Design a protein around this motif. Sequence first.
Motif, PDB file in Angstrom:
ATOM      1  N   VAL B  32       0.848  -1.189   0.000  1.00  0.00           N
ATOM      2  CA  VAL B  32       0.000   0.000   0.000  1.00  0.00           C
ATOM      3  C   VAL B  32       0.888   1.245   0.000  1.00  0.00           C
ATOM      4  CG1 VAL B  32      -1.946   1.149   1.103  1.00  0.00           C
ATOM      5  CG2 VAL B  32      -1.644  -1.301   1.375  1.00  0.00           C
ATOM      6  N   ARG B  33       0.459   2.261  -0.744  1.00  0.00           N
ATOM      7  CA  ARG B  33       1.206   3.512  -0.860  1.00  0.00           C
ATOM      8  C   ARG B  33       1.216   4.391   0.393  1.00  0.00           C
ATOM      9  NH1 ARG B  33       0.513   1.344  -5.292  1.00  0.00           N
ATOM     10  NH2 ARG B  33       1.066   2.036  -7.409  1.00  0.00           N
ATOM     11  N   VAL B  34       0.580   3.903   1.452  1.00  0.00           N
ATOM     12  CA  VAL B  34       0.514   4.624   2.726  1.00  0.00           C
ATOM     13  C   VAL B  34      -0.313   3.862   3.766  1.00  0.00           C
ATOM     14  CG1 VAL B  34      -1.534   5.949   2.053  1.00  0.00           C
ATOM     15  CG2 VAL B  34       0.037   6.819   3.812  1.00  0.00           C
ATOM     16  N   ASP B  35       0.096   3.928   5.031  1.00  0.00           N
ATOM     17  CA  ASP B  35      -0.636   3.217   6.077  1.00  0.00           C
ATOM     18  C   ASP B  35      -0.624   3.803   7.480  1.00  0.00           C
ATOM     19  OD1 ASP B  35      -0.791  -0.181   7.353  1.00  0.00           O
ATOM     20  OD2 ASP B  35      -2.376   1.216   6.753  1.00  0.00           O
ATOM     21  N   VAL B  52       6.656   2.807  10.858  1.00  0.00           N
ATOM     22  CA  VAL B  52       7.188   2.036   9.748  1.00  0.00           C
ATOM     23  C   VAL B  52       6.186   1.993   8.581  1.00  0.00           C
ATOM     24  CG1 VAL B  52       7.480  -0.473   9.231  1.00  0.00           C
ATOM     25  CG2 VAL B  52       9.005   0.676  10.848  1.00  0.00           C
ATOM     26  N   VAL B  53       6.673   2.220   7.360  1.00  0.00           N
ATOM     27  CA  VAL B  53       5.817   2.228   6.164  1.00  0.00           C
ATOM     28  C   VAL B  53       5.581   0.810   5.652  1.00  0.00           C
ATOM     29  CG1 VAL B  53       5.406   3.258   3.910  1.00  0.00           C
ATOM     30  CG2 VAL B  53       6.818   4.450   5.587  1.00  0.00           C
ATOM     31  N   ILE B  54       4.604   0.165   6.276  1.00  0.00           N
ATOM     32  CA  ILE B  54       4.233  -1.214   6.015  1.00  0.00           C
ATOM     33  C   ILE B  54       3.522  -1.483   4.692  1.00  0.00           C
ATOM     34  CG2 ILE B  54       4.085  -1.602   8.464  1.00  0.00           C
ATOM     35  CD1 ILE B  54       2.389   0.509   8.007  1.00  0.00           C
ATOM     36  N   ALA B  55       3.416  -2.770   4.375  1.00  0.00           N
ATOM     37  CA  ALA B  55       2.762  -3.250   3.170  1.00  0.00           C
ATOM     38  C   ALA B  55       1.412  -3.820   3.598  1.00  0.00           C
ATOM     39  CB  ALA B  55       3.604  -4.337   2.522  1.00  0.00           C
ATOM     40  N   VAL B  93      -4.915   2.289   7.528  1.00  0.00           N
ATOM     41  CA  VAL B  93      -5.170   2.602   6.116  1.00  0.00           C
ATOM     42  C   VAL B  93      -5.304   1.277   5.366  1.00  0.00           C
ATOM     43  CG1 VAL B  93      -4.454   3.882   4.056  1.00  0.00           C
ATOM     44  CG2 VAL B  93      -3.755   4.678   6.289  1.00  0.00           C
ATOM     45  N   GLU B  94      -5.898   1.321   4.175  1.00  0.00           N
ATOM     46  CA  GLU B  94      -6.093   0.118   3.366  1.00  0.00           C
ATOM     47  C   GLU B  94      -6.242   0.471   1.886  1.00  0.00           C
ATOM     48  OE1 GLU B  94     -10.931   0.045   4.344  1.00  0.00           O
ATOM     49  OE2 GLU B  94      -9.655  -1.646   4.915  1.00  0.00           O
ATOM     50  N   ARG B  95      -5.444  -0.177   1.042  1.00  0.00           N
ATOM     51  CA  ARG B  95      -5.494   0.061  -0.397  1.00  0.00           C
ATOM     52  C   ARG B  95      -4.770  -1.064  -1.130  1.00  0.00           C
ATOM     53  NH1 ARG B  95      -7.681   3.296  -4.776  1.00  0.00           N
ATOM     54  NH2 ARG B  95      -6.083   3.386  -6.423  1.00  0.00           N
ATOM     55  N   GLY B  96      -5.245  -1.373  -2.334  1.00  0.00           N
ATOM     56  CA  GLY B  96      -4.630  -2.431  -3.117  1.00  0.00           C
ATOM     57  C   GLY B  96      -5.519  -3.642  -3.321  1.00  0.00           C
ATOM     58  N   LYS B  97      -5.865  -3.901  -4.580  1.00  0.00           N
ATOM     59  CA  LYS B  97      -6.719  -5.024  -4.948  1.00  0.00           C
ATOM     60  C   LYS B  97      -5.957  -6.287  -4.561  1.00  0.00           C
ATOM     61  CE  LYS B  97      -9.013  -8.224  -7.144  1.00  0.00           C
ATOM     62  NZ  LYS B  97     -10.309  -8.745  -6.629  1.00  0.00           N
ATOM     63  N   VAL B  98      -4.635  -6.129  -4.467  1.00  0.00           N
ATOM     64  CA  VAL B  98      -3.657  -7.144  -4.074  1.00  0.00           C
ATOM     65  C   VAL B  98      -3.624  -8.533  -4.697  1.00  0.00           C
ATOM     66  CG1 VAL B  98      -3.234  -6.052  -1.832  1.00  0.00           C
ATOM     67  CG2 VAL B  98      -4.859  -7.981  -1.977  1.00  0.00           C
ATOM     68  N   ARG B  99      -2.460  -8.821  -5.260  1.00  0.00           N
ATOM     69  CA  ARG B  99      -2.108 -10.102  -5.841  1.00  0.00           C
ATOM     70  C   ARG B  99      -1.574 -10.617  -4.514  1.00  0.00           C
ATOM     71  NH1 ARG B  99       0.215  -6.988  -9.774  1.00  0.00           N
ATOM     72  NH2 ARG B  99       1.179  -5.780  -8.079  1.00  0.00           N
ATOM     73  N   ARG B 100      -2.270 -11.565  -3.907  1.00  0.00           N
ATOM     74  CA  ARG B 100      -1.871 -12.054  -2.596  1.00  0.00           C
ATOM     75  C   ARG B 100      -1.057 -13.337  -2.633  1.00  0.00           C
ATOM     76  NH1 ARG B 100      -5.718 -11.201   0.009  1.00  0.00           N
ATOM     77  NH2 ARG B 100      -7.451 -10.375  -1.249  1.00  0.00           N
ATOM     78  N   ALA B 101       0.105 -13.278  -1.987  1.00  0.00           N
ATOM     79  CA  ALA B 101       1.031 -14.397  -1.898  1.00  0.00           C
ATOM     80  C   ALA B 101       0.393 -15.525  -1.091  1.00  0.00           C
ATOM     81  CB  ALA B 101       2.333 -13.958  -1.231  1.00  0.00           C
ATOM     82  N   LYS B 102       0.518 -15.431   0.226  1.00  0.00           N
ATOM     83  CA  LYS B 102      -0.009 -16.435   1.140  1.00  0.00           C
ATOM     84  C   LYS B 102      -0.828 -15.879   2.306  1.00  0.00           C
ATOM     85  CE  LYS B 102       0.648 -19.770  -0.182  1.00  0.00           C
ATOM     86  NZ  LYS B 102       1.099 -18.728  -1.144  1.00  0.00           N
ATOM     87  N   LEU B 103      -0.658 -14.580   2.547  1.00  0.00           N
ATOM     88  CA  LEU B 103      -1.289 -13.815   3.624  1.00  0.00           C
ATOM     89  C   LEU B 103      -0.702 -14.336   4.924  1.00  0.00           C
ATOM     90  CD1 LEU B 103      -3.372 -14.029   1.226  1.00  0.00           C
ATOM     91  CD2 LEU B 103      -5.021 -13.105   2.842  1.00  0.00           C
ATOM     92  N   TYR B 104      -1.037 -13.680   6.032  1.00  0.00           N
ATOM     93  CA  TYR B 104      -0.486 -14.071   7.320  1.00  0.00           C
ATOM     94  C   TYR B 104       1.019 -13.924   7.109  1.00  0.00           C
ATOM     95  CZ  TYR B 104      -3.285 -16.060  11.159  1.00  0.00           C
ATOM     96  OH  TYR B 104      -4.073 -16.225  12.276  1.00  0.00           O
TER      97      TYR B 104
END
Lengths: 205, 125, 114, 132, 58
Positions: B32-35, B52-55, B93-104
């Motif tokens: 995400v571009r911001v959180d 920290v600028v998290i994903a 914050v929340e953004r991104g349709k996300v191509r999700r790896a495995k989550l968690y």
Amino acid sequence: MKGILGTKIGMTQIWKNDRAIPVTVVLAGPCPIVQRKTAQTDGYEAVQIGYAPKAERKVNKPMQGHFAKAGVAPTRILREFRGFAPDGDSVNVDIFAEGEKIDATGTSKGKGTQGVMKRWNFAGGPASHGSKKWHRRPGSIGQRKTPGRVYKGKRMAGHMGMERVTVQNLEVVEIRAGENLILVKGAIPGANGGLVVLRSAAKAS
Amino acid sequence: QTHIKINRGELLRGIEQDHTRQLPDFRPGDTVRVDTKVREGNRTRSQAFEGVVIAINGSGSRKSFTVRKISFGEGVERVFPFASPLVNQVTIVERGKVRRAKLYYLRELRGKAARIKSDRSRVMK
Amino acid sequence: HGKAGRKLNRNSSARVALARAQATALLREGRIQTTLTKAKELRPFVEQLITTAKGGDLHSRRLVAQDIHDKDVVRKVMDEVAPKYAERPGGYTRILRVGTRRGDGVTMALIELV
Amino acid sequence: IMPQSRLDVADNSGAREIMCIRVLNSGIGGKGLTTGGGGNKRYAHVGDIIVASVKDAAPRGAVKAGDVVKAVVVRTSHAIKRADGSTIRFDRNAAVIINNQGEPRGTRVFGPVARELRDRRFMKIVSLAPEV
Amino acid sequence: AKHPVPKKKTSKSKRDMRRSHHALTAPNLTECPQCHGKKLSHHICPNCGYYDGRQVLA
RNA sequence: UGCCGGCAUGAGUAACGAUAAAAGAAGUGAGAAUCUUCUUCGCCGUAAGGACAAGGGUUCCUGGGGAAGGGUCGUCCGCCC
RNA sequence: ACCCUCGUUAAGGAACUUUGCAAUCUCACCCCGUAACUUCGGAAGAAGGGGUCCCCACGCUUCGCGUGGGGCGCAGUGAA
RNA sequence: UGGCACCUCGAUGUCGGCUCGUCGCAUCCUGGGGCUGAAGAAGGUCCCAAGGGUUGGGCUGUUCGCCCAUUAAAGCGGCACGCGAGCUGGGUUCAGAACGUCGUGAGACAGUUCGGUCUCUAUCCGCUACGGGCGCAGGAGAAUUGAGGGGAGUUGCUCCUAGUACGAGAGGACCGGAGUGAACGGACCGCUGGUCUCCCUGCUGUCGUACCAACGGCACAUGCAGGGUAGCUAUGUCCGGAACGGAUAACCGCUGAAAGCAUCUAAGCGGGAAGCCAGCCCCAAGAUGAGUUCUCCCACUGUUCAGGUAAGACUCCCGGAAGACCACCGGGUUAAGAGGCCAGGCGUGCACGCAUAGCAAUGUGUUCAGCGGACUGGUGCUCAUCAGUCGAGGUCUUGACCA
């Protein structure tokens, strides 16, 4: 010089603006039931009595201990010590405010006569070759022939310790609505669904 | 002794939630571009917003939640499972349709930085 | 030491390869006889699987099919096992003793119906 | 923490190969030189001293070759959690050049640094601190 | 390889006070639900085959 | 600190042998868990296959009985007839 | 308990210790790639780099590889 | 290091290393004290008792030893310079060979060097444990106050009256204070992780279904890459030695005797940190130096002889994060105890049917659910009819005492 009640279950809990550690315990109020005096039966005293049972088909002898000015069913007994207090129930929410440095105590853990390697935690003695010794043994523990009665030490195998650990200092969490809750912060003894006598500040100034 | 014939767990799950009051965010959505951002400490207050600028990624189990599934790169890696249960932090914050790896969590990768590690996880090798 | 329950004495590959030539003597027979523990932790298998046996699907016949290598395991679980007791959740066959081995000590019941 | 210990970019003085092995402390942030201090442990903390093994060297500007000197550290990867129901940790960290007396030669740190080095009597720590 | 041989023995005197800390628990407790008398430690006949209801067989 | 013959005790513990899975229906009868008619399992199969070499000499069978042996025992032996 | 046997680690990888025997690690084929020393035939089949399954315009194709668009998984002689 | 050759040759194998270490103090580092040619910072020697405690690298077989940094400091005499009923041999000190001089040669050296098997069915005394019982006098479920047996203690460092008393200048206290750490007691699962030998996905090779999406047997008793709950333990987190009374040694007094002055005149008393009484826990009034309380059975007769009638212990059925057995616990139906089924996470992450691009490897959709070994539970169903064993009423004497 107050409450006393069944362990069982713990967890981590919020503190100010974080999470910290925490511990928890359950309770009720067995109620006194017996009250004598100072003339035989020695000092002051009292006898806790009650928790969660069906003592009916239990036996026909304990059912009579259960007799004063109260009812319902009792499970365990125990006592406390000298001191003054009303004739109510067990709870950390009685008359003595909230925020007290209670000191719990625990029994044991379901074990069974094991090695001193555990009674000492260190079983030094490198033996990566020969394997006559699997490192589990202390070794040495002996001398010549000048007498020898194995001392009275030697924490060899036996039966471990349902004995009292008296944890001492262990801060309280929060008191919320409900028929008494009570929690703490710092392991707390008594294997899972323990009991614990719970005791007042003993630290020596 | 604390076992007889009574179910007391509305402290373990009641008094437990007697203090909560939050609908987190609950988006494991990566890149995400911001959180969110911790309130910091340091001085008297000076409650800053640049932890920290998290994903954003992860979940957990009850009052613990190993939040961070982020780290970075200037400092090799560096995760630090923060506490989802807190009343001293910015409300996400929340953004991104996300191509999700495995989550968690993942733990693997986390060193296979290079370049093609933007917000995807499939690869041909 | 540990506890809780549910263990394993007989092989560690005997947990998906045992009753498949042991408790398999129940489809066409039912004269099953195997340990005073196996059976007690066998309930979590027999009366257990049945909800996907109430009728008939395909996936409801997979590790319902290939899990007890046979024919009656499917050609009877649908319209003769599941419906045989498709009115009571758990609890049916009366497994108990039978008369031990005479020498050591291990009983093994029988399992039947009616 | 730990004797040898393999890491990555150090003070960015020179080279991409460094060392550390011995530990020294006294609970100060830049006193001087005395007889003793502390370090009966088996590792370090973060903003400590730690007699680090020089091993390498820097180009040629104010740092020698074989050199030898009581170096320092940056971060670690053992114990402590950030209190906020989380943690903060690496599996590498760096070193940076910090005078034997305790006068942090802090030229220009590059890459992320630490935020926990703000109770470790940072002083010359966190200033030119890139990422935080 | 031989570890300190037997030498001293333990015939009589001892070898007596060793049939008491075990022996056999001594039983004869119960005698079946209703008819005749078997029962075991909570376990049905083979006689009438029952603790109170249908089971086993003559 | 002899020698043989017998009783010993170490003591009923250590141990049943290379840790290379087995359940059961049924024959029988003295009861059957390891026999037998057999669907399912798995270990070897350049083997722990079959023939030739040395050997044992009675192995193989029509089968038959426990005194004893196969270091449980057993209605299986290539014990014994 | 302990005990022989097997596997998986946060934190350092031999500081352990008489010395990494042991332990445990680790060393595919094709191509290109390759030293001080050297009786040049070697020291290295060294180090190192790409692929090797699949649909396909296509060989000596009754069997390999191959200039290409691409398919599955975190990774492809992938177990040994 | 030895002088003795007394029993040990029906034979007791150097030293050292890990670990168990537990003793002593003369005290190796605290403590309160004598003095100090000591201003402080910090020491120099001595007094008193144990309360504790004392590293990692280099070499060696190392005792020892010096070399590197630490450490409040790194002890001294214990124990056949602790011990293979641990290992190790590693040196060397068993037989092989080489060197150095030598004996003529065979050969000699706690002169040097390379490798160089190593024990052994624990009856036991004894110790760490759990049980069979016996027991102070009617039989019993359990709750209790106690001698006392053990556990039972070390320390650097910021800031403050501290930049002060002291010091002509660098610097810096007797008191304690909240504060950071170590090997070191436990605990606890719910911050960190592994472990999981069967719950899933990924892949090569072989077979069984004819055959295919699709699965199983073998690859340590999961093959290979990864994941995993209930549990365990450390790096996981918290707590651990600090008030204080009797009374010490080092030392300080109130009156100051006898030698009419004075000294702590042992003739009146105080201040004295650590041990010792105590303060935290087990055990435990069977410590035979038999302590107290809630609680159950009985007003009858026949084998110095004598009954038809028990409640509590128990065979036990299904179970316990309790374990070899077993002291403690849950249901035996007046019935919710393990399992199946069911609401829900859980992990393989979008199962199977079918239609399609079309060469089609595969993909999309319906399904972040299908699938889920012991999970908060629910369902009283798979199990629970019942049936049995101590079948009994306070020993002698004298006192506080009852009409």
